[PDB]
Paper text:
Transient receptor potential vanilloid (TRPV) channels are a group of six polymodal cation channels subdivided into two subgroups by their sequence identity and functional properties. TRPV channels are blocked by ruthenium red (RR), a universal pore blocker for a wide array of cation channels. Here we use cryo-electron microscopy to reveal the molecular details of RR block in TRPV2 and TRPV5, members of the two TRPV subfamilies.
Next, we prepared cryo-EM grids of wild-type rat TRPV2 reconstituted into nanodiscs in the presence of 1 mM of the robust TRPV2 activator 2-APB and 1 mM RR. This dataset yielded a single stable high-quality state: 2-APB-activated RR-blocked TRPV2 (TRPV22APB+RR) with C4 symmetry at 2.9 Å resolution. The strong extra density at the TRPV22APB+RR SF was clearly visible from early stages of data processing before application of any symmetry and is aligned along the central symmetry axis; the size and shape of this density is consistent with the expected dimensions for RR and density consistent with 2-APB is present at our previously proposed 2-APB binding site and not in the vanilloid pocket. The SF of TRPV22APB+RR has adapted to accommodate RR, with tight coordination by the backbone carbonyl of Gly606 along the interior of the SF and the lower gate is closed at Met645. The primary site for RR stabilization in TRPV22APB+RR is the carbonyl of Gly606, which at distances of 3.0–3.2 Å can form hydrogen bonds with ammonia groups coordinated to the central and bottom ruthenium atoms. Additionally, density for the top ruthenium atom was more poorly resolved than the lower two ruthenium atoms, indicating that the top ruthenium group is not tightly coordinated. The only significant conformational difference between TRPV22APB+RR and TRPV22APB_AC is at the pore, where a downward rotation (9°) and shift (1.1 Å) of the pore helix to accommodate RR leads to subtle shifts in S5 and S6 which constrict the lower gate at Met645. The rest of the channel maintained the previously observed activated conformation, where the C-terminus is in a helical conformation rather than the loop conformation seen in the inactivated state. Our TRPV22APB+RR structure revealed that binding of RR to the 2-ABP-activated TRPV2 stabilized the channel in an intermediate conformation, preventing ion flow through the occluded SF and closing the lower gate at Met645, but at the same time inhibiting the transition to the inactivated state. This TRPV2 locked in an activated conformation allowed us to resolve clear density for 2-APB in our previously proposed 2-APB binding site, but not in the vanilloid pocket, a recently suggested alternate 2-APB site in mouse TRPV2.
Numbering used by the authors:
A (entry chain A), B (entry chain B): 31 to 45, 72 to 417, 429 to 530, 532 to 563, 589 to 694, 699 to 720
């Protein structure tokens, strides 16, 4: 285990009048500069420096200056200025101010990080004025984002200040003469203070207000400080911009704010929403499509559909501009959606005919042509599904609850092709596969219920249970096998249940409401056999009643309004897929919106126009 | 797509020192009148006028004055007075102030509409003083009432002011010397400012308070301004008065207010409720029956029962006066309701006897007389239902959930007459129709459960499910046919399910709790047949459990108090129908209430007396 960062109780580990580490750590933690007065002479005589291993905590590299800054009284410690002076007077080739922790838990942590976290502006000035490097990165495992004891803030001093909500510190780090911070500076993950603010977001009303106020403030500060730099166009090492990371992470509160952002006055160029005209309850705005429109690779639309794993995903697609943008893409695409459904219906009708009236193991030529059409249709679907899974490869397995139709379309195509292979091999097992393929092909027809709102919102309200059906079956099949062996073993002796599979299927019938209690008067232990069947029935009815109740509690503890939101996400995934066109013929992707000058920095952007009517909001504005 | 009404970003389309449109639109949008100083000379030299196509936006006809009024700074634009002066000085045969948009989206929109919407009283005065026509109608598709981007306010300047809650503007438009507005003036739909206020209503607490305050204020203003005009007696082009339109539209908050309206002092003639005497918790009021009592065609009672499609309909019939009026009409009618039920019981008893003991394909004469009575009874019911559907023709298909008994009474009569026709033709299919008619005739008996409160409120709480029964059957019958073809196809091969209909009916039994899992040891693929039946059962139980849960969520998310309200609406529909009498004998409709002088304008009205006891309200009035 790593040592505590500071402790009143446990001493730091080991792993002319004398001035050892424990003497030094005692004076600086008490804060009494007059007791430091032998130290320069001792160091000089020995040729030792305060950076040396003998003066650190052995396991971390934590120095006397870090010890001093961990121990502040009313934001001050009178040792810091003398101790820094002694380092300068010593002639150390390294600088004490820039010393860092070397432990795998606290790696790169420095006195400046501690000063900022202790909220002492005086110490921040005092360190920066004495040559503190404002770009050292606290990159150790305590500082990385994961489960358990950690605090991610980015890794830089400016990013800590921002995430700790210290505006005085942030402005001093940016504006100071000695070593000004950079808004462009980046951590070991490529995250810039704007990315760090997106990562610390939690979608809570308070955290959101802090994050939004610190994000906007820094963006305004950047407009003054570094006017030639687009701070929101800088990408992580995963090639995400702060808006794209807010989408990936599912930080809906900050995502909404960035996407909708509007300012008047000198900061207008920092807007993404530009209000165009109002009339009564009608508001028309232009929205900036930059990095949002599916025209370009790795957009927020593709990230929300494919790369995000947040439960928030459906809530994100119903925000403007995305809600109107996706509606326009759907209105353009919907003819191709019903054409695809028509082709699938024709294929499934030909499949149904070819399955239904087929000989036992002109009309023969029509049956052969029918087999050929379903073989070709099965190959075509197989290729299309293989291309889908290959195109998704970097983010497969994100959401089975959105993906499962793509697996079942693959499965139906595989069994169709395999059945037609076995039919060419003339082997009787082809008929089972063709019939099982017909069954999946009819069930797969439910995919298209998303293409109509009436059937799309009903299907989404329902399609709740298929996750619970497994948990039931797995638990129950364990009861089933135990009672099945017990029945077979007990039925061997004469004065039914002949095999484990036979007995399991009888016990299954008793579960699904098809049971048959009677005295089995053929066999010796008929009373004990009846006891087992009674016990099995009662335990099964308990387990079913438990399942029903568990499920019903999650029905009372539910909100109906998600149904429309989840249906919009299904249409979004459909739109984004079919905007590519088919595996055998790529689509020309045209850009949405139009290119307009929104001001001067010439600030020209692809803007999408959105018209919103809001009687409630407008009436609140009246006298 | 139509252009934006105004844009900072997109220039208006095209489709002596020079003074083109872009020079002109630039000066007036900036608001700098000194830059306008060449324009008169240029226009004069060319013989051009500011109304001409060259100076408009080409696609809309939007003029420089509309551009000027779209761009107000602190409610002003210093260009307007110079620009109007230049139009007068030009000698234009048209007047710039009265220029209007010609686009199909903004048709008839004018500078005065924009000024009012921008809430600039100064511009309204400045336009009216320079000859603005206060009766131009904004009738384009943006201004009509429909789905998507629009704002209906009526179409007139006075109606916009009222719906935008501008009392200063409303009074100035009414009272000014130059061109006074008319409270009687009417839009392209016949709607007068009072109708427009009913159309903008939404039944929300805030919208209702605005609408009510603007309606009452205008009605008081009309009493002063145009004393000889009954503003509430003016009809739409659909022949509806503002009260009747509030009923049709289902605007229950404004409907209640108009219906119940009471004033003391100089405005007393504007009342519809007149308080008569109070004693402790007892209040007696007269209510004005004008346009409310079913005596006259197209009353609010007939509109609520027949012509309204709002979910609010049941809430509207329980307001006074209507609640006591309908109770008095029911108390008068109820003998005829039970007489009709007695005749239907006698017919259904004779039908039951004649169906039950009938020969295979004196007592014979009694059976023939029984057939004649049910033929005549079936003809009589057929005619009565045909007359009902013809009388309803303008508003059939409003509410199947209120109408369905009128369809099922028609259906039973058709099958009865047709069965007796086939019985005269001596063909064996008559017995199925007579028996199917008997079944419907017994189910139709449930209609009369509304005639008693004990059975009327119980039936209404229940009769929830019949809409969900279809959605279940349709989805489920698609699973059924897919598995049915699959079973038939798989059962053809020997070592049950012989036909698609046979297999479908077996799979139906498995759904309704009558299933039969067994190894079908007669046929080759018995294991795969059992796999299909297991899969079918499990998918069916998932689909049933989904339906049960969906339905149960709409049971927790429900309010029981609607039951009594919906039963009153059923009695209202019954009352209004039977007040006509029968298809073979029209009823004399007597008027309700009595003719009383409620004041002097002699203000004599048909008043209905209502007595209400309200301990709770009265006790709040005590010290
Ligand atoms: C109207 C007459 C049709 C005759 C039958 C043709 C074979 C159809 C095979 C089939 O079922 O295709 C369905 C497919 C839509 O797939 P999807 O995107 O919904 O699947 C995934 C949904 N979850 O449809 C398409 O991709 C478009 C149809 C084929 C275009 C021509 C192909 C030419 C190839 C050289
Ligand atoms: C007491 C002895 C009765 C002997 C049987 C007479 C035939 C009755 C046929 C029948 O079922 O009539 C029901 C009908 C009421 O209909 P409704 O308004 O409830 O239907 C719609 C409800 N949803 O009832 C009536 O309209 C009134 C009864 C008939 C009056 C005499 C007719 C003379 C014609 C020249
Ligand atoms: N034939 C299309 C009917 O649409 B509906 C529908 C039918 C089956 C599955 C899903 C939706 C519908 C939904 C609610 C009430 C009434 C009908
Ligand atoms: N015979 C008339 C009984 O009325 B009740 C009634 C019976 C059947 C259908 C509807 C209502 C009733 C209602 C609630 C509690 C008890 C009885």
């Amino acid at each position: 285990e790593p040592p505590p960062m500071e402790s009143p109780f446990q001493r730091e580990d080991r792993n002319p009048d004398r001035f050892d580490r424990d003497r030094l750590f005692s004076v600086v933690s008490r804060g009494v500069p007059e007791e430091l007065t032998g130290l320069l002479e001792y160091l000089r005589w020995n040729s030792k420096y305060l950076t040396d291993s003998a003066y650190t905590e052995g396991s971390t590299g934590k120095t006397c200056l870090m010890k001093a800054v961990l121990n502040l009284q009313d934001g001050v410690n009178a040792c810091i200025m003398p101790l820094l002076q002694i380092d300068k007077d010593s002639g150390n080739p390294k600088l004490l101010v820039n010393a860092q922790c070397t432990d795998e838990f606290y790696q790169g942590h420095s006195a400046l990080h501690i000063a900022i976290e202790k909220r002492s502006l005086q110490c921040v000035k005092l360190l920066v004025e004495n040559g503190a490097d404002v770009h050292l990165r606290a990159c150790g495992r305590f500082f990385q984002k994961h489960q358990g004891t950690c605090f991610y803030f980015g890794e830089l001093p400016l990013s800590l200040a921002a995430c700790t909500k210290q505006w005085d510190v942030v402005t001093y780090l940016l504006e100071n003469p000695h070593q000004p911070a950079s808004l462009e500076a980046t951590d070991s993950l490529g995250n810039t203070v704007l990315h760090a603010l997106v990562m610390i977001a939690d979608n809570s009303p308070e955290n959101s207000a802090l994050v939004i106020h610190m994000y906007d403030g820094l963006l305004q500060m950047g407009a003054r400080l570094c006017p030639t730099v687009q701070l929101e166009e800088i990408s992580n090492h995963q090639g995400l911009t702060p808006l794209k990371l807010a989408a990936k992470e599912g930080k809906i509160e900050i995502f909404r704010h960035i996407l909708q952002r509007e300012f008047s006055g000198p900061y207008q160029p920092l807007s993404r929403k530009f209000t165009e005209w109002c009339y009564g309850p009608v508001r028309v705005s232009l929205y900036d499509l930059s990095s949002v429109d599916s025209w370009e690779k790795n957009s927020v639309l593709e990230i929300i559909a494919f790369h995000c794993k947040s439960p928030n995903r459906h809530r994100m697609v119903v925000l403007e501009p995305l809600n109107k943008l996706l509606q326009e893409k759907w209105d353009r695409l919907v003819s191709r959606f019903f054409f695809n459904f028509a082709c699938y219906l024709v294929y499934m009708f030909i499949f149904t005919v070819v399955a239904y009236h087929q000989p036992s193991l002109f009309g023969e030529s029509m049956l052969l042509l029918g087999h050929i059409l379903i073989l070709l249709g099965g190959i075509y679907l197989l290729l299309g599904q293989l291309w889908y899974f290959w195109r998704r490869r970097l983010f497969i397995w994100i959401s089975f609850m959105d993906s499962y139709f793509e697996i079942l379309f693959l499965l139906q195509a595989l069994l169709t092709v395999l059945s037609q292979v076995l039919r060419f091999m003339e082997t009787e097992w082809y008929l089972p596969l063709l019939v099982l393929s017909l069954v999946l092909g009819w069930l797969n027809l439910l995919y298209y219920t998303r293409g109509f709102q009436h059937t799309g919102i009903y299907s989404v309200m329902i399609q709740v249970i298929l996750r619970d059906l497994l948990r039931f079956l797995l638990v129950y099949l364990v009861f089933l096998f135990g009672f099945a062996v017990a029945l077979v073993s007990l039925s061997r002796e004469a004065r039914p249940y002949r095999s484990i599979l036979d007995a399991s299927l009888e016990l299954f019938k008793f579960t699904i409401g098809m049971g048959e209690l009677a005295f089995q008067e053929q066999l010796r232990f008929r009373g004990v056999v009846l006891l087992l069947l009674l016990a099995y029935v009662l335990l099964t009815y308990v387990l079913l009643l438990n399942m029903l109740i568990a499920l019903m509690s999650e029905t009372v503890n539910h909100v109906a309004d998600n149904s429309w939101s989840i249906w919009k996400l299904q249409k979004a995934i459909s739109v984004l897929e079919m905007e590519n066109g088919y595996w055998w013929c790529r689509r020309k992707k045209h850009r949405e919106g139009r290119l307009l000058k929104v001001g001067t920095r010439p600030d020209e952007r692809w803007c999408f126009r959105v018209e919103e009517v809001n009687w409630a909001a407008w009436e609140k504005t009246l006298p």
